[PDB]
Structure 1
């Protein structure tokens, strides 16, 4: 009860100290050469990022861990804008995230082994979101073959689009718990953390593939959109021009979908008008 909270304070402040000082100095790299031996704290940082409960976070207490990711992101960012990324770029990338990470997590199709899987799934998704927050994610992005970052577009489909569908065996449709809701949202944010997916995304939408059930049939894309509505339409809005042009023109023989998706565009656009005014007027003009 006390040793934890103490050392939690201590790590949080040492991280804060590093970032706000060993970086805010314009020639702080000389200080880095003074605090030369730091690989230790790098691994501590990354262990917190990846498995916070191991160190300090171990309290799980809402006020402290609320600010923990913010500090982590800021420190990560500082290490970006400063040199000495090699230790970052290596010691973080090649250890807490890899290609095999997504597949080796992807194996358990939300199995009854509940207390196990979505744990590390969520750990990874939170961590990667935090990375993108710091925007060092692309350094963890491995080299691919096409402008479309298969790295994450593929995990999109192979985790949800294939994942949500039991049509490969015509078994019972897997109901989603709020656990599944939040996990899916995280995965979607992941997919959308990388530019150049939306076209594939609408392809995943405007697909006349039909799901089976319970005997009724309903278009799989309709399920996918109806379920993850807010995140989808959000991201579609995030690149409104490209999505609009593709929705209009790449789409033929599309009655239900194109309608519904455009309505959703308009809707979730209006839903947030106090937040901004330059988002829908442009959407209106385009469509």
Structure 2
């Protein structure tokens, strides 16, 4: 009856080691050396094992109360652990001709995202009572590979950067960093994240403005840090490092709107980064200083002529959709006070407010 709890018992009464299959695929591969290994080995033989592990976990607690006592010596020390060493070898080989090389890459992802799927899928579900993460002392490899969720887009494909694989990557980091939230000791996190928290954070963000020309290449890296931090919203420990960078640095992204809007710089895609930048920003900073920035920014031949109306308005034509969808997002009735405090602007903000809200919810 109890699928898992039941049948697992009678199996361990019969045998303890009555499930695992294969034995690695790394030196034997340097002894053989072929293309089909790259096809079954590194696309399923590793993942078939991973998968049977995955779905066997969510069943019964046997991966905790019974697996723990299976081996600690001969045949065992070549299973889970070295499988990790094939995840370090997975970042490695993910880095290092046409369609064949591509099956190499897409395979390397198709495995490694499932392995992240399983570090997660394990951690946030399998370690109950929080006493099993300490099993994989190669706790290090996984960190050093998953976190490079920006150096991963470089390691796996850029095509897959487009192929809706990074329509799933933010969700996968969401997952792993989600098992990294709250659940494990908060020290894992700083050994994980406290590797490029700030420093670059301020440097690339200011740097889009210091950069200027050849912008879009760099904007790629920007929306990588941007989106990847949007992944951090789903994650923790942002609060030690990113709400001081929220009060200071997201306000700084508001100054980014303020300065960048004068020049009309760069293309409509960087005009899409400002929606991003302000998105990952406002999704963490206060809206008080924003609503303030509405009217306040407003009070602060042809050129200056339309300019008076433009730094008055276009900062609220462009970013309108995300600002509406930003403080409608979290606080009712704060806005109120904002808009009346403005005067004569009230109409665009409030009309696009009712408007865009109306659209989103129903």
Mapping of residues 146-225 of structure 1, within 5 Å: 150=251, 157=258, 214-215=302-303, 217-218=305-306, 222=310
- How far does residue 93 in structure 1 lie from its aligned partner after superposition? 3.3
Moved more, 65-74 or 92-101: 92-101
Q: How many residues align?
A: 259
Per-residue displacement from partner, 1:55-114 (whole Å, max 9, x unpaired)?
366633524332221111011111113113313224313415447534664354562313
Q: Distance in 1 between matches of 2:213 and 2:182?
A: 44
Q: Cα–Cα, structure 1 residues 147 and 7, in superposed 2: closer, same or farther, change >3 Å?
A: closer
Tell me if structure 2 keeps the 8 A contact 1:105–1:121: no
Please give the alpha-carbon distance, in whole angstroms, between the structure 2 residues aligned to 1:70 and 1:131: 11
User: 5+ residue gaps in structure 2?
Assistant: 1-101
Distance 1:165 1:46, change over 3 A: closer
Change (3 A) 1:137 1:46: same
Deviations 1:101-134 (A, max 9, x none): 3466435456231343212211111111111133
| Cα RMSD (Å) | 7.3
Distance 1:215 1:194 in 2: 22
- TM-score (norm. length: structure 1): 0.61
- Measured in 1, the distance between the counterparts of 2:274 and 2:150 equals 35
Cα displacement (A) at 1:175: 18
Moved more, 157-166 or 84-93: 157-166
- The answer to whether the 8 A contact 1:132-1:193 is kept is no
- Aligned residues of 1:105 and 1:117 also touching (Cα < 8 A): no
Cα contact 2:251–2:285 (8 A) shared by 1: no
Contact 2:120–2:176 under 8 Å retained in 1: yes
Cα shift at 1:39: 1.9
Alpha-carbon offset, residue 33 of structure 1: 1.3
- Structure 1 residues not aligned, in runs of 5+: 200-213, 274-287
Does structure 2 retain, via aligned residues, the 8 Å contact 1:15–1:75? yes
Deviation readout 1:250-275 (Å, 9 max, x if unpaired): 678955422322222222233335xx
Larger Rg: 1 or 2?
A: 2
Superposition TM-score, scaled by structure 2 size: 0.51
Contact 2:253 2:277 in 1 (8 A): no
